[PDB]
């Protein structure tokens, strides 16, 4: 898409700079590995 109340999520809107979702996915994905290790040692 960069080649060339207001947002929406999971679709092809063409919104604009979208870091904040892959900040987010980032973020989910960091916290879940955490908890992936402690579970399997615990």
């Not at 898409?1 to 604009?16: I, P, T, Y």
């Not at 980032?26 to 879940?32: A, D, N, R, Y």
């Amino acid at each position: 898409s960069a080649l060339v109340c207001s947002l929406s999520q999971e679709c092809d809107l063409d919104q604009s700079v979208y870091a904040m979702v892959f900040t987010l996915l980032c973020s989910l994905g960091i916290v879940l590995c955490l908890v992936t290790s402690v579970t399997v040692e615990w």
